Amino acid sequence: NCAKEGEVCGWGSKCCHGLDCPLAFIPYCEKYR
């Protein structure tokens, strides 16, 4: 559902909404820049 900056997305989370989670082998939720 949601993840905190430094969390693994695409396999564990997908960014709550304030984080950017790209679709890759090992993507991580990070603030949009």
Q: What are the b/e assignments for 6-15, b being 16+ CB within 10 Å?
A: ebebbeebbb
CA distance 30 to 13: 12
Experimental method: NMR
CA distance 16 to 18: 6
DSSP codes joined into one string, the chain = ----TT-BBTTTB---SSEE---SSS-B-EE--
